[PDB]
Amino acid sequence: FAAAVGLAAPQXPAF
């Protein structure tokens, strides 16, 4: 599951 977070992670600041 690490990939799930690592790939998403840089988009988080869209919040």
DSSP labels for the chain?
Answer: -HHHHHHHGGGGGG-
For residue 1, give both structure tokens.
């599951």
CA torsion angle 15 2 4 9 (round to 10) = 20
**Residue type (1 letter), 13:** P
CA distances from 4 to 10, 14, 15 (A): 12, 17, 18
Experimental method: X-ray
